[PDB]
Amino acid sequence: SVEGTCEECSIDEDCKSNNGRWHCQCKQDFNITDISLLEHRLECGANDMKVSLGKCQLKSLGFDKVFMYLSDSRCSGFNDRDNRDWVSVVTPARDGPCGTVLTRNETHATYSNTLYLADEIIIRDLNIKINFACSYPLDMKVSLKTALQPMVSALNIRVGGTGMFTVRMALFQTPSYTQPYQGSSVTLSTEAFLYVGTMLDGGDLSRFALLMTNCYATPSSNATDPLKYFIIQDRCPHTRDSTIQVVENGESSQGRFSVQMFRFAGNYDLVYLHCEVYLCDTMNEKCKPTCSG
Amino acid sequence: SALNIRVGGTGMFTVRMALFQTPSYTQPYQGSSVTLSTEAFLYVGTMLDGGDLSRFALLMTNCYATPSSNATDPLKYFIIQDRCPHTRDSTIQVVENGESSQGRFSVQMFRFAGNYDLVYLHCEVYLCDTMNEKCKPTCSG
Amino acid sequence: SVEGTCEECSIDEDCKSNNGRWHCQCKQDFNITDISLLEHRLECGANDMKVSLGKCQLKSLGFDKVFMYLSDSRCSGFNDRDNRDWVSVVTPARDGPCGTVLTRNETHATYSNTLYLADEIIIRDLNIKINFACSYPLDMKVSLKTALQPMVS
Ligand SMILES: *[C@@H]1O[C@H](CO)[C@@H](O[C@@H]2O[C@H](CO)[C@@H](O[C@@H]3O[C@H](CO[C@H]4O[C@H](CO)[C@@H](O[C@@H]5O[C@H](CO)[C@@H](O)[C@H](O)[C@H]5NC(C)=O)[C@H](O)[C@@H]4O[C@@H]4O[C@H](CO)[C@@H](O[C@@H]5O[C@H](CO)[C@H](O)[C@H](O)[C@H]5O)[C@H](O)[C@H]4NC(C)=O)[C@@H](O)[C@H](O[C@H]4O[C@H](CO)[C@@H](O[C@@H]5O[C@H](CO)[C@@H](O)[C@H](O)[C@H]5NC(C)=O)[C@H](O)[C@@H]4O[C@@H]4O[C@H](CO)[C@@H](O)[C@H](O)[C@H]4NC(C)=O)[C@@H]3O)[C@H](O)[C@H]2NC(C)=O)[C@H](O)[C@H]1NC(C)=O
Ligand SMILES: *[C@@H]1O[C@H](CO)[C@@H](O[C@@H]2O[C@H](CO)[C@@H](O[C@@H]3O[C@H](CO[C@H]4O[C@H](CO)[C@@H](O[C@@H]5O[C@H](CO)[C@@H](O)[C@H](O)[C@H]5NC(C)=O)[C@H](O)[C@@H]4O)[C@@H](O)[C@H](O[C@H]4O[C@H](CO)[C@@H](O[C@@H]5O[C@H](CO)[C@@H](O)[C@H](O)[C@H]5NC(C)=O)[C@H](O)[C@@H]4O[C@@H]4O[C@H](CO)[C@@H](O)[C@H](O)[C@H]4NC(C)=O)[C@@H]3O)[C@H](O)[C@H]2NC(C)=O)[C@H](O)[C@H]1NC(C)=O
Ligand SMILES: *[C@@H]1O[C@H](CO)[C@@H](O[C@@H]2O[C@H](CO)[C@@H](O)[C@H](O)[C@H]2NC(C)=O)[C@H](O)[C@H]1NC(C)=O
Ligand SMILES: *[C@@H]1O[C@H](CO)[C@@H](O[C@@H]2O[C@H](CO)[C@@H](O)[C@H](O)[C@H]2NC(C)=O)[C@H](O)[C@H]1NC(C)=O
Ligand SMILES: *[C@@H]1O[C@H](CO)[C@@H](O)[C@H](O)[C@H]1NC(C)=O
Ligand SMILES: *[C@@H]1O[C@H](CO)[C@@H](O)[C@H](O)[C@H]1NC(C)=O
């Protein structure tokens, strides 16, 4: 048009501009013949089927006027009216109108129809008819979007059970803590080094650490005895004794303390070992006590 | 002389289902979620928003509920098993299925056993051609 | 079973015997509903927690098939396999598996989990969920059994 600017013509096709001579054409993108003959696009809709070809392709192929017809002449092509580059026709997805037929097999149905293309009403050299069909699945997945939150009169009852963990300690001979003892009693000398370690036979949670809050020896099996020799006092070993060394405590489930043998002063011949232990959570507590060792 | 070139296009039909309140199937819901009680009766129907061909009938091959939106879940409660409703539950009644495009099944609300609070509904459907298939399944209801 | 005698069925539940008609049921000991709803037993283990209810109670309450589930559906109930009267489920005493959580305070830690009971997958009238927890002391007394007899010059 001699009034509208580049917006007057389709954006896809270049808008040529010169003094006293304005027009719009296309580029190498849509310029060739053979691929244009092979060029097309199709759209299968829920209720309609659309087939379109580039109008610039038709113009370049010499088809200034385009006549699009189907098996039924009542169906006729027309401009896209949405994107001006294309020219398209519509066909209802049924059998009987617009010349469409229904091809059905067990898997899923299909609709087939033919499109006739020509430059004019009559055909002189080539009669190109496009055979096209849309396949619609006969089985499909459907999901309800809206979820549900049902209400029920529920009965909730608290149950509480006391539990106890399993804890044991062993007397090892070597500094490597290899062989536990099994006899009910043992004999040793003062110069002998008493290597002892503790273990949890169950509940070896990674975040639960073993911390010796305090340890002591007793002349008798009865823990409640006034004569106590604290080996670990308030999470740390007793000082003034170089022989007291602990390799690990609170690092993991394996808590080991090293000390040499001793004997209570008096008529007490037998010596027992007792300990108190606090399980430490690594999430919050550092579980690595530090003191004036 | 004529040139013929084959063209094919993958398409899909439009299918949707709605949750009605009344036994007459009048008002669909619109909210993303709803709350209900066990005694409440869950009336549901399915419709085709397009392609309402007279000879294509709607047949519920199987329906089931899922605790989550993901259909591929082992915990499935089949409400319709192989084109027929699950027995041992008098509350399961379907007014129409395969007669026309309007397939409706009636059941009362339920809740999955466990920690699952939300329940979803999924279905599979087979379109039936009235020309050849009777499309009126019969079974030991 | 039409082959095994009274030993075939659990001793706790009475074994009924008649010509052409044998079976086993229970007595007034396990027959009522309300106390059965209130009846249960729990066991807190060192590494596992067990909760069980009388199978005869479930049968008498109309729950011919029993579905026991927890906060995590991977955990499922099963027969006791030690005393056939009970039916029980197991849960490791940790946080994360089987839906269990860890409730901790300064005195001592505690593990809590919920048990879901139903006759079938779906629930129609009542949704009874049993909230249970085991308390494990965080401080405990340990004594070495083996005494010592040191030698001195
Ligand atoms: C019912 O009915 C219905 C109807 O509808 C059905 O269904 C259907 O079916 C049909 C048939 O099968 C189909 O079609 C097919 O397809 C396939 C696949 O495809 C592929 O590819 C593509 C591309 O191309 C892709 O993508 C696509 O695309 C499209 C476009 O194109 C679109 O549309 C869509 O969308 C897409 N897809 C989707 C899914 O979406 C796909 O994916 C696929 O992929 C891949 O690819 C590859 C490559 O290509 C492949 O491989 C290759 O292939 C070739 C062909 O292509 C060959 O085969 C070779 O060998 C191979 O290696 C693979 O495989 C795939 N994957 C899978 C499968 O997975 C296809 O494959 C086919 O093809 C065939 O066929 C055709 C026809 O039809 C033919 O063509 C022919 O050719 C010749 C030469 O060769 C000439 O001459 C002529 O002319 C032509 N035409 C006619 C014949 O017509 C071809 O070739 C082939 O054939 C054969 O093959 C063999 C092997 O096996 C050989 O050996 C032989 O040789 C041949 N033949 C001859 C003759 O030669 C077709 O195309 C449809 O699809 C359906 N539908 C649906 C919806 O799907 C049903 O089934 C019924 N039922 C009852 C029961 O009946
Ligand atoms: C960190 O967290 C741990 C959590 O484990 C905590 O340690 C536990 O604390 C609880 C609370 O103290 C302990 O359980 C209390 O035991 C008290 C004394 O023992 C009772 O009860 C035993 C049965 O529970 C019984 O026999 C025991 O039976 C077990 C089998 O079931 C067996 O395994 C065990 O060996 C055996 N022996 C024991 C345990 O020694 C005992 O023989 C003895 O009779 C008991 O008095 C307590 O009852 C009070 O507390 C509970 C809540 O814990 C209340 O329950 C509430 O009741 C309401 C109705 O009244 C109801 O609506 C609520 O739903 C319900 N639940 C709540 C509130 O959570 C009780 O009613 C009662 O509460 C108050 O009592 C006062 C005075 O009597 C009364 O005036 C109030 O009215 C009443 N409250 C209310 C709301 O009415 C518990 O049963 C547990 O034993 C501890 N664990 C261990 C391993 O010992 C730590 O302390 C905690 N630490 C910190 C720092 O926070
Ligand atoms: C095809 O592409 C050509 C681009 O070469 C379009 O116009 C041509 O422009 C060049 C400018 O360098 C001229 O030398 C050519 O003479 C032009 N083509 C002709 C045929 O004169 C052309 O418009 C595009 N479309 C068609 C249908 O040829
Ligand atoms: C509950 O206890 C009764 C005992 O009275 C069990 O069976 C009953 O046996 C008496 C025999 O005097 C019959 O008169 C009753 O008819 C029996 N009960 C029924 C329901 O018929 C009974 O098996 C026990 N358990 C249950 C679940 O009822
Ligand atoms: C341990 O000793 C204390 C006090 O000496 C006493 O009260 C307690 O009964 C004793 N216990 C045993 C088991 O000997
Ligand atoms: C659904 O669950 C299956 C298996 O449980 C899984 O393979 C799939 O990825 C899941 N899909 C979605 C969307 O969650």
Author numbering:
A (entry chain A): 292 to 584
B (entry chain B): 444 to 584
C (entry chain C): 292 to 444
Article passage:
Here, we report a cryo‐electron microscopy study of uromodulin (UMOD)/Tamm–Horsfall protein, the most abundant protein in human urine and an archetypal ZP module‐containing molecule, in its mature homopolymeric state. Hepsin protease‐mediated cleavage of the CCS leads to dissociation of mature UMOD from the CTP and triggers its incorporation into homopolymeric filaments. These protect against urinary tract infections by binding to uropathogenic E. coli (UPEC), reduce nephrolithiasis, and are involved in the regulation of water/electrolyte balance and kidney innate immunity. UMOD forms a one‐start helix with an unprecedented 180‐degree twist between subunits enfolded by interdomain linkers that have completely reorganized as a result of propeptide dissociation.
D Representative micrograph of UMODe filaments, showing the absence of branches. K Sharpened cryo‐EM map of UMODe (4.0 Å resolution) in two orthogonal views oriented as in panels (D and E). Comparison of this map with that of UMODfl identifies density belonging to the N‐terminal half of UMOD (salmon contour in the front view of panel F), which is lost upon site‐specific cleavage by elastase (orange arrow). E Superposition of the UMODfl (salmon) and UMODe (cyan) cryo‐EM maps shows that only the former shows density for a globular domain protruding from the core of the filaments. This reveals the approximate location of the elastase cleavage site, corresponding to the N‐terminus of UMODe, within the structure of UMODfl (orange arrows).
